[PDB]
UniProtKB/Swiss-Prot annotation:
Broad substrate specificity glycosidase. Releases glucose from soluble glucooligomers, with a preference for longer oligomers; acts more readily on cellotetraose than on cellobiose. Displays similar activities towards the disaccharides lactose and cellobiose. Is also able to hydrolyze various aryl-beta-glycosides in vitro. The keyword Manganese does not apply. It catalyses: Hydrolysis of (1->4)-linkages in (1->4)-beta-D-glucans, to remove successive glucose units; Hydrolysis of terminal, non-reducing beta-D-glucosyl residues with release of beta-D-glucose. Keywords: Carbohydrate metabolism, Cellulose degradation, Glycosidase, Hydrolase, Polysaccharide degradation. It comes from Thermotoga neapolitana (strain ATCC 49049 / DSM 4359 / NBRC 107923 / NS-E). Belongs to the glycosyl hydrolase 1 family. Pathway: Glycan metabolism; cellulose degradation; Glycan metabolism; beta-D-glucan degradation. Optimum pH is 6.5. Monomer. This is 1,4-beta-D-glucan glucohydrolase.
Length: 443
């Protein structure tokens, strides 16, 4: 067997916008994903989070599914504008009541809650004031964080400030592909720095309010390999690693500076006098969460942004067109240990999209998803054998859900959702996962 360590947490993950539906129910304010998805042309097939998996109403059934799979941890997010509809000021009781029932039901079933404070659904009221571009967001974020900690910290001891900082900054403000849908490189690198500042203020407030709790942060990561051994290609791959992965945010947290190749490129776009904020940004955290899905080959290209371009390879891909490179999860894990040595690490999301179909007697035979999860879990195990202090792994996702600019066309679940009826069907991957948990590993 590939046996995991004793007490290793096997989990599943979702996010509020992607599964809940009912975005304006019970006094909630609009989010940027609401306005973005309700703008024609931004999301495939005109899809929105208006309904999604109707988790707002079906949450208790969904937790009974988690319990039936036997996951010991559930990473979910809280919708900011359900808690503070104007972003700051008056707290909405109905929003607290919704998540309190989730928390209490989890604890009563001995599932550990991991709460993500921010998983991309910014209150639209704050977007009108510049959102992540406005330096004052660090204080609004601290104040929202306080509200959660003072209401939920008695029961929840594992917290994540922000999910996928790079994506919020770059995809949302440079590429315009996610909310709020901008294309400005200066705004983009301003958001990078403000997300760090908001994380930091959040942690300080956490040390005052949840003294027996653990707080961390989650990064997207890709495994970048150079197209050749030539110095310029190696540098291009290191540049992509420094920009796209955990060093963009951990170099400031651990070393007090942005990574070196990123600075060469982006010094001009960062706030003037950003160095004045470093001391604050450097707050101790309890763990690092890493997401991972795919790898990319990259080369030096003197006519591309940042002198880098991607080179497509003839490797198996998911339905997203993403290349399947399981060894990437091992090098990412081994890389964070070597470069920053965090005392505790989680994979907070790993999974795949494939075009599932419902068979015969209501079964989803997703052999493709099982093979993907197996290969990546085996690499994670190898990372633990080589000293990485990995405490847990979470599958993205529990449920098929709204895949941001892809809409409902991309299914990541270990549980299928029929959107015509809201029926849930556990997939062959879910029963396979359940069995991994029962053996605490592979065989």
């Amino acid at each position: 067997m590939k046996k995991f360590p004793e007490g290793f947490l096997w989990g599943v993950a979702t996010a509020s916008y992607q599964i809940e539906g009912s975005p304006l129910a019970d006094g909630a304010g609009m989010s940027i994903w609401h306005t973005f998805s309700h703008t024609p042309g931004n999301v495939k097939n005109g899809d929105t989070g208006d309904v999604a998996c109707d988790h707002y109403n079906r949450w208790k059934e969904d937790i009974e599914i988690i319990e039936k799979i036997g996951a010991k941890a559930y990473r979910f997010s809280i919708s900011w504008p359900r808690i503070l509809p104007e972003g700051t000021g008056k707290v909405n009781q109905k929003g607290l009541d919704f998540y309190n029932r989730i928390i209490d039901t989890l604890l009563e079933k001995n599932i550990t809650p991991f709460i993500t404070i921010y998983h991309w659904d910014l209150p639209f009221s704050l977007q009108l004031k510049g959102g992540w571009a406005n330096r004052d967001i660090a204080d609004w974020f601290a104040e929202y964080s306080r509200v959660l900690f003072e209401n939920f910290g008695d029961r929840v001891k594992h917290w994540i400030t922000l999910n996928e900082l790079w994506v919020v900054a770059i995809v949302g403000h440079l590429y315009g592909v996610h909310a709020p849908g901008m294309k400005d490189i200066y705004v983009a690198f301003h958001t990078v720095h403000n997300l760090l500042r908001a994380h930091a203020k959040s942690v300080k407030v956490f040390r005052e309010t949840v003294k027996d709790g653990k707080i961390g942060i989650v990064f997207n990561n890709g495994y970048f390999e150079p197209a050749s051994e030539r110095e310029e290609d190696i540098r291009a791959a290191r540049f992509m690693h420094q920009f796209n992965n955990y060093p963009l945010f951990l170099n400031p947290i651990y070393r007090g500076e942005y990574p070196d190749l990123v600075l060469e490129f982006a010094r001009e776009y960062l706030p003037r006098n950003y160095e004045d904020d470093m001391e604050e940004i450097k707050q101790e955290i309890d763990f690092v969460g890493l997401n991972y899905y795919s790898g990319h080959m990259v080369k030096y290209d003197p006519n591309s942004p940042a002198r880098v371009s991607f080179v497509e390879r003839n490797l198996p891909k998911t339905a997203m067109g993403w290349e399947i490179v399981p060894e990437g999860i091992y090098w990412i894990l081994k890389g964070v240990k070597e470069e920053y040595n965090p005392q505790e690490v989680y994979i907070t999301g790993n999974g795949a999209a494939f075009d599932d179909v419902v068979s015969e007697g209501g079964k989803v035979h997703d052999q493709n998803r099982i093979d993907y999860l197996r290969a990546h879990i085996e690499q994670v195990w190898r990372a633990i054998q080589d000293g990485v202090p990995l405490k847990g792994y979470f599958v993205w996702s529990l449920l098929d859900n709204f895949e941001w600019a892809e809409g409902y066309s991309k299914r990541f679940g270990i549980v299928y959702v029929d959107y015509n009826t809201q029926k849930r069907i556990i997939k062959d991957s879910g029963y396979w996962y359940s069995n991994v948990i029962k053996n605490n590993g592979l065989t």
